[PDB]
Design a protein around this ligand. Structure first.
Ligand SMILES: *[C@@H]1O[C@H](CO)[C@@H](O)[C@H](O)[C@H]1NC(C)=O
Lengths: 41, 48
């Protein structure tokens, strides 16, 4: 909690997000192989 | 609207989906530019 990290970004023209603009300029973020449930296990 | 089109609005060529925009343009403003300076909104010439 202390550390803060197409159809969604198509409807996100009313708001402004830096993730949608980075996706539209071709810069995507791959997910990690291990989820937080697995690093916690 | 809601389809990919090779658009030529007032001589601005582009390839993108076009949708209705909540953004309001002042009369002098005809185009909207994002952080990368790429047009993100265009006021249609035939229909404002
Ligand atoms: C342009 O023509 C269309 C079709 O008649 C009309 O709907 C529109 O209001 C016109 N726009 C201007 C700025 O005259």
């Amino acid at each position: 909690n202390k550390v803060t990290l197409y159809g969604d970004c198509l409807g996100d023209i009313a708001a402004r997000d830096l993730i949608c603009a980075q996706k539209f300029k071709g810069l995507t973020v791959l997910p990690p192989l291990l989820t937080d449930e697995m690093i916690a296990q | 609207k809601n389809k990919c089109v090779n658009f030529n609005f007032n001589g601005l060529k582009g390839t993108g989906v076009l949708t209705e925009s909540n953004k309001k343009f002042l009369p002098f403003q005809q185009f909207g530019r994002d952080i990368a300076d790429t047009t993100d909104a265009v006021r249609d010439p035939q229909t404002l």
